[PDB]
Amino acid sequence: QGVNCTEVNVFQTRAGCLIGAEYVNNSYECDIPIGAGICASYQSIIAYTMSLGAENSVAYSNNSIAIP
Amino acid sequence: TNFTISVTTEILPVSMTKTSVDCTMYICGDSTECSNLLLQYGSFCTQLKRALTGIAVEQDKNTQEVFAQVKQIYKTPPIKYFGGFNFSQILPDPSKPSKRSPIEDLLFNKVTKGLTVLPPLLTDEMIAQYTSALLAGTITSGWTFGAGPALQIPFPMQMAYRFNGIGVTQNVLYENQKLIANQFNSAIGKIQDSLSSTPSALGKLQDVVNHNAQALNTLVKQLSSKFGAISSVLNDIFSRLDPPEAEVQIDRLITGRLQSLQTYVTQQLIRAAEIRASANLAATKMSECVLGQSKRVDFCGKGYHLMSFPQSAPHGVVFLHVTYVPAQEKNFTTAPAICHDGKAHFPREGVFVSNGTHWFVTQRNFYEPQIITTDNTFVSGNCDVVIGIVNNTVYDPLQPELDS
Amino acid sequence: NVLYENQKLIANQFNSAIGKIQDSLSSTPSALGKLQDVVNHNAQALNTLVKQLSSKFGAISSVLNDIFSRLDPPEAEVQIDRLITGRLQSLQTYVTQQLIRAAEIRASANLAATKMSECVLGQSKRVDFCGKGYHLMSFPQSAPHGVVFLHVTYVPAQEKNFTTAPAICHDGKAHFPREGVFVSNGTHWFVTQRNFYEPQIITTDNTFVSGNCDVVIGIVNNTVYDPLQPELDS
Ligand SMILES: *[C@@H]1O[C@H](CO)[C@@H](O[C@@H]2O[C@H](CO)[C@@H](O)[C@H](O)[C@H]2NC(C)=O)[C@H](O)[C@H]1NC(C)=O
Ligand SMILES: *[C@@H]1O[C@H](CO)[C@@H](O[C@@H]2O[C@H](CO)[C@@H](O)[C@H](O)[C@H]2NC(C)=O)[C@H](O)[C@H]1NC(C)=O
Ligand SMILES: *[C@@H]1O[C@H](CO)[C@@H](O[C@@H]2O[C@H](CO)[C@@H](O)[C@H](O)[C@H]2NC(C)=O)[C@H](O)[C@H]1NC(C)=O
Ligand SMILES: *[C@@H]1O[C@H](CO)[C@@H](O[C@@H]2O[C@H](CO)[C@@H](O)[C@H](O)[C@H]2NC(C)=O)[C@H](O)[C@H]1NC(C)=O
Ligand SMILES: *[C@@H]1O[C@H](CO)[C@@H](O[C@@H]2O[C@H](CO)[C@@H](O)[C@H](O)[C@H]2NC(C)=O)[C@H](O)[C@H]1NC(C)=O
Ligand SMILES: *[C@@H]1O[C@H](CO)[C@@H](O[C@@H]2O[C@H](CO)[C@@H](O)[C@H](O)[C@H]2NC(C)=O)[C@H](O)[C@H]1NC(C)=O
Ligand SMILES: *[C@@H]1O[C@H](CO)[C@@H](O)[C@H](O)[C@H]1NC(C)=O
Ligand SMILES: *[C@@H]1O[C@H](CO)[C@@H](O)[C@H](O)[C@H]1NC(C)=O
Ligand SMILES: *[C@@H]1O[C@H](CO)[C@@H](O)[C@H](O)[C@H]1NC(C)=O
């Protein structure tokens, strides 16, 4: 936490570098929170950006309605 | 006879900066003998570490439950047209690389050893994205996204539903839609100028930050306290005094530091409980004021509540309460009932209104005089039971159908 | 009316949901995780209180009888005083922690009391206060050092696209729905509620007239059915 490992699978984050876990570009649901926009999870252990949710862009119109 | 659209701001804190306290090197430093003597004090540092981790995860849970209210991220449509209404102040600016609204950017700009500042799980970026998704859901789907799946609705339809929820008919919406849009834009600009020109509008978050900083500074300064010892430096006592007593001096210094740490932990726990209560209140306001229309008075702003726009704040949340304020009252004459052929007529949803000569019916929240007919009135009882009944006739819409 | 239309379907859906969530409660230990964490905190407090008796507090022994029978009384009084004040500080720390936990538990109990006053003894119109979606009702249950409410909620599904209009201009007059909304399937306009699809013929019983149709924006032209003319034709 806050200790830069350049003067001590390496991924440098804002809180600190993570050793032993590889960074993945793809984003999934987090399991073990870490902080500073990153967290680790087990699937080997990997780290990825948080998945806020499924993207759903609703079509908006001033004359269209949706009735359940 | 007139209405005013007013925008009010409510600031509620969410959490604080997460702090981790290392007992061993703060109380005794790098001295091995002091650490060995501290090992005979029990599990005080372990208990404090457990309490601090519990406070940190409590703050994380509060931040998750106040911001991540929906599991679906909604994106604004490419066309930013809502019948003349303006929302660029609350929508994120694509020009800014931070993906934050100008109101959010101004709000962020207006807010400024053994202790490690643990960063929060949710930083500014995904909190701003959550607020943008919630704004898109409440500007496109209304309150339906908070009630299950997203049900698209036009903005005038949502506004008409919201004013129908507070007992105002939708006829006045179509007659003065441009007036409503202009009043909303003027109120948004006025509240933006007011928040830009008022440094004291962020008093709660600034006070919380100042209290945390003062607590950290006080804990730092307690290391220089002698606590009745010969000196405040452990190494000076070790290299200048006999051990037989020097161990008593070390014990006195470490129990003074432990008492100061206990005071800090109690203060942090009290502050965390207060902030948890404030975050529960903020979550209730997010669930009620923003995700729907609340009929509660004074809960979501002054007067009748229409909607609330959430914005991202540093260690807090700011609600843009847009409300309905009646204005320009006019004197009028009432009547308990209308006596027609020995029958008493009462309004179904409005009240009898008179300007001095004729008698009409109008809503409680707006002056909309209509002809007194049998469709909007019901008959229950005769005229001698009520007190102060006036004499007037009731127009029958069915009568001209068979008159000719 | 839709409740009486498909009452058997509603009952079957409710029974299936109740059975599914009853099966899911056994396989999900995270539901009672808050109560388990409270019990674990209680056990941790007891363990800390037990372990505090093993602390020497800078002395030579953790037993005061050993100090009394082992060390000279003129300074054994000071040693016993030091042990007394150390254990007193530990007890004060435990008391403050218990008081903070009591404040948190009292706040949670007040919140639960408010929830059972709102959406157990009656129907609450609050959105997502005690259940996701349009909350219908809740079923209170008893738990060890906790309370579980089986919240039943109304969730709309199977949305359909439709074309809507602010009003209907008929005979130079604008007609607004009293409680529903005007929808169009492509050729005809119908009125239905905002939470279900029940199309109906545009009739003056559920619509009111307020002004003409040249002041509104986005209106369409359609006739309005009134049964008075067919009643008076024959
Ligand atoms: C109700 O108040 C609004 C303003 O609060 C009035 O709108 C103004 O109307 C005058 C003339 O009609 C214009 O010169 C102003 O520019 C309008 N103000 C705004 C902010 O647009 C409105 O006329 C009032 N209605 C009644 C019936 O008195
Ligand atoms: C909505 O409000 C924004 C901000 O007030 C308007 O943007 C301004 O537009 C004028 C001229 O159109 C410029 O002189 C200002 O510099 C703009 N301000 C900012 C902050 O960009 C915008 O025109 C309004 N209307 C719409 C439809 O967006
Ligand atoms: C009270 O309101 C009624 C309705 O507007 C007024 O009656 C109209 O008054 C105007 C001008 O005085 C006349 O041109 C209309 O012919 C009247 N209508 C009818 C049906 O007769 C009435 O004058 C108002 N009373 C006061 C004291 O202002
Ligand atoms: C309003 O109408 C009522 C009923 O037509 C009037 O009440 C009558 O008053 C007279 C004398 O005041 C009595 O002899 C009748 O017995 C009353 N009838 C009833 C049904 O009460 C009343 O006077 C009228 N008010 C005004 C101001 O003209
Ligand atoms: C919209 O709905 C209406 C009523 O549900 C449809 O009108 C009916 O269409 C069927 C199909 O041919 C006819 O058999 C009926 O006689 C029609 N009823 C009336 C009262 O005209 C209409 O076709 C639907 N429109 C679309 C585009 O599906
Ligand atoms: C909807 O109905 C209105 C009124 O029936 C139409 O307005 C008239 O349109 C005709 C020709 O389109 C003109 O000659 C009249 O002068 C209009 N009257 C008024 C009061 O505006 C309107 O055009 C209709 N809309 C559509 C799309 O046909
Ligand atoms: C750690 O140090 C390296 C070089 O010493 C530097 O490039 C890097 O930015 C540092 N990491 C952080 C988070 O500052
Ligand atoms: C409604 O949308 C149409 C485009 O589909 C546009 O031409 C029209 O101007 C819009 N009306 C309002 C009041 O924004
Ligand atoms: C309604 O239409 C829009 C675009 O026209 C589409 O995105 C949406 O999926 C449609 N709704 C349904 C239920 O298919």
Asked whether C185 lines ligand 5 (CB < 6 A), one says: yes
Q: Which residues contact B129 (CB under 8 A, 6 or more apart)?
A: A52, B73, B99
| Integer Cα distance of B214 and C8 in angstroms | 64
Q: Are B273 and B294 in contact (CB under 8 A)?
A: no
Buried b (16+ CB within 10 A) or exposed e, B175-195: eebeebbebbbebbeebbeeb
Specify burial of residue C183 (Cβ count, 10 A radius: 0-12, 13-18, 19+).
buried
Does residue B259 line the site of ligand 4, with CB under 6 A?
no
Nearest to A62 by CA among C217, C222, C193: C217
Q: Which residues of B touch C134 (CB under 8 A)?
A: 147-148
Q: Are B176 and B185 in contact (CB under 8 A)?
A: no
**Pairwise CA distance, residues B171 & B183, whole Å:** 18
Backbone angles phi, psi at B261, to 5 degrees: -65, -40
CB atoms under 10 Å from CB of B9, counted, come to 19
Kindly identify the ligand whose nearest atom is closest to the C-alpha of B395. Answer: 3
Give the angle subtended at the CA of B180 by the CAs of B178 and B183, to the nearest 5°: 105
H helices present in A1-68, as ranges: none
Residue type, B292: G
Stated as kind and residue range, the H or E segment containing A35 is strand A32-35
Query: Rounded to whole angstroms, what are the CA distances from B111 to A35, B18, B202, B315, B316?
Result: 22, 18, 7, 10, 11
> CA-based diameter of chain B, in Å?
122
φ/ψ (deg, to 5) at B200:
-90, 0
What's the token pair of residue C102? 């009591």
Q: Does A29 touch chain B (CB under 8 A)?
A: no
Query: Does the distance separating the beta carbons of A52 and B157 come in below 8 Å?
Result: no
What is the rounded distance in angstroms from the CA atom of residue B325 to the CA atom of residue B8?
12
Interatomic CA distance for residues B107 and B138, integer angstroms:
22
- Which residues, listed in sequence order, are joined to residue C149 by a DSSP beta bridge? C140
Q: Are strands C160-165 and C181-184 parallel, antiparallel or unpaired?
A: antiparallel
Output the furthest CA–CA distance in chain C (Å, rounded). Answer: 121
* DSSP helix/strand/coil, A42: strand
Distance, C-alpha C164 to centroid of its chain: 33
Helix (H/G/I), strand (E/B), else coil: B358: coil
Regarding beta strands B390-391 and B338-340, do their DSSP bridges make them parallel or antiparallel, or are they unpaired? parallel
C161 Cβ closer than 6 Å to some ligand 9 atom: yes
State the Cα–Cα distance between residues B338 and B380, nearest whole angstrom: 11
Q: Are the C-beta atoms of A51 and B69 separated by less than 8 Å?
A: no
Do B115 and B21 touch, CB atoms closer than 8 A? Answer: yes
Q: By CB neighbour count within 10 A (0-12 exposed, 13-18 middle, 19+ buried), where does B317 fall?
A: buried
Residue partners of B157: CB distance under 8 A and separation at least 6: A65, C164, C166, C181
Measured CA to CA in angstroms, residue C74 lies from B108, B110, B252, B289, C61 at distances of 64, 63, 19, 70, 17
Contact across the interface for A60 and B152, Cβ inside 8 Å: yes
CB contact under 8 A, A67 and C157: no
CA torsion sign, C141 to C143 to C145 to C148?
negative
Residues C72, C8: Cα–Cα separation, whole Å: 87
Closest to B110 in 3D by CA, of B305, B391, B311: B311
Decide: B355 in ligand 3 pocket, CB within 6 A.
yes
Count of residues making up chain A:
68
DSSP B252: H
In angstroms, the CA C84 to CA C91 distance is 10
Treating both helix axes as pointing N-terminal to C-terminal, what angle do B44-67 and C73-119 enclose, rounded to 10 degrees? 20
| DSSP 8-class letter at C186 | S
Q: How are strands ordered across the β-sheet holding B390-391?
A: B377-379, B343-347, B338-340, B390-391
CA atoms within 13 A of residue B368's CA, in its CB half-sphere = 18
Mutate to test the pocket of ligand 3, among B1, B330, B332, B355 (most ligand atoms within 8 A of CB): B355
User: CB contact, 8 Å: B371 with chain C?
Assistant: no
Q: Specify the DSSP element, H or E, that contains C152.
A: strand C146-154
Q: After which residues is chain B broken (C to N over 2.5 A)?
A: 112
Conformational region of residue C144, where left means phi above 0, alpha means psi within -120 to 50, and beta covers everything else: beta
What is the rounded distance in angstroms from the CA atom of residue B260 to the CA atom of residue B262?
5
CB contact under 8 Å between B171 and C210, yes or no, is yes
Judge contact between A60 and B140, C-beta under 8 A.
yes
Which phi and psi angles does B143 have, rounded to 5°?
Answer: -95, 5
- The backbone region for A3, taken as left when phi is positive above 0, alpha when psi lies in -120 to 50, beta otherwise, is beta
CB C219 within 8 A of CB B175: no
Report the Cα A9 to chain-centroid distance in Å: 17
- Environment class of B232 (CB within 10 Å of its CB; exposed 0-12, middle 13-18, buried 19+): middle
Question: Which of A21-27's residues contact partners 24+ apart within 8 Å by CB, and which partners?
Answer: A21/A45, A21/A46, A21/A47, A22/A46, A22/A47, A23/A47, A23/A48, A24/A48, A27/A51
Q: What is the β-pairing status of strands A64-67 and A32-35?
A: unpaired
CA proximity to C128, closest of B286, A3, B33, A10: B286
- Nearest of B165, B290, C165, C219 to residue A65 by alpha carbon: C165
CA dist., res. B289 & res. B302, Å (int)? 12
* Beta-bridge partner residues of C190: C183
How far apart are alpha carbons C161 and B233 in whole angstroms? 76
Cβ contacts of B158 within 8 Å, gap of 6 or more:
B142
Separation of CA B24 and ligand 7 centre (Å): 28
Q: Which two tokens stand for residue C46?
A: 């007891």
Nearest residue by C-alpha to atom 6 in ligand 2? B88
How far apart CA B90 and CA C76 sit, in angstroms, is 71
**Is the shortest distance between the CB of B391 and ligand 4 below 6 Å?**
yes
Q: Would you say C226 and C204 are in contact if contact means Cβ atoms under 8 Å apart?
A: yes
Q: Which residue has the tokens 């099966």?
A: C23
The answer to whether C227 and C203 have CB atoms below 8 angstroms apart is yes
Residue with structure tokens 């020097």?
B246
B174 at the C interface (CB within 8 A)?
yes
Reading the block at residue C218, the tokens are: 């986005």
Tokens of B72: 């679906």
Q: Touching B: which chains, 3+ CB pairs < 8 A?
A: A, C
Q: Are B101 and B89 in contact (CB under 8 A)?
A: yes
What pairing do the DSSP bridges indicate for beta strands B72-73 and A54-55?
parallel
Q: Could you give the CA distance from residue C123 to residue C111 in angstroms, rounded to a whole number?
A: 17
Cβ(B334) to ligand 4 under 6 A? no
Compute the Cα dihedral for B382, B384, B386, B390 and give only its sign. Answer: positive
φ/ψ of B326, rounded to 5, equals -70, 155
Q: What value does the CA radius of gyration of chain C take, rounded to a whole number of Å?
A: 35
Report whether B347 contacts B377 (CB < 8 A): yes
| Contact assessment for residue B311 and residue B320, using Cβ atoms and an 8 Å cutoff | yes
Q: Would the CB atoms of B154 and A65 count as touching at under 8 Å? A: yes
Residues of C in contact with B258 (CB under 8 A): 89
Q: What are phi and psi of A32, to 5 degrees?
A: -115, 105
Q: Which DSSP string corresponds to C42-100?
A: HHHHHHHHHHGGG--TTSS-S-HHHHHHHS-HHHHHHHHHHHHHHHHHHHHHHHHHHHH
Give contacts of B148 with chain C, Cβ < 8 Å: 132-134, 155-157
**What six digits make up the tokens of B65?**
């439950």
Q: Ligand 1 within 6 A of B185 CB? A: no
Give 3-state DSSP helix, strand, coil % of chain B, rounded to 5. 45, 15, 35
Amino acid sitting at position B186:
S
How far is the alpha carbon of A58 from chain C, nearest alpha carbon, in Å?
12
Cα–ligand 3 centroid distance for B274 (angstroms): 61
Distance, in Å, from the CA atom of C155 to the CA atom of C136, rounded to the nearest integer, reads 10
User: b/e string for C33-50 if b means 16 or more Cβ within 10 A?
Assistant: eeeeebeeeeeeeeebee
Grouping H, G, I as helix, E, B as strand and the rest as coil, residue B137 is helix
Q: Which two tokens stand for residue B40?
A: 């005979």
Burial of C75 (0-12, 13-18, 19+ CB in 10 A): exposed
Q: Are A58 and A66 in contact (CB under 8 A)?
A: no
CA of C105 relative to ligand 4 center, distance in Å: 67
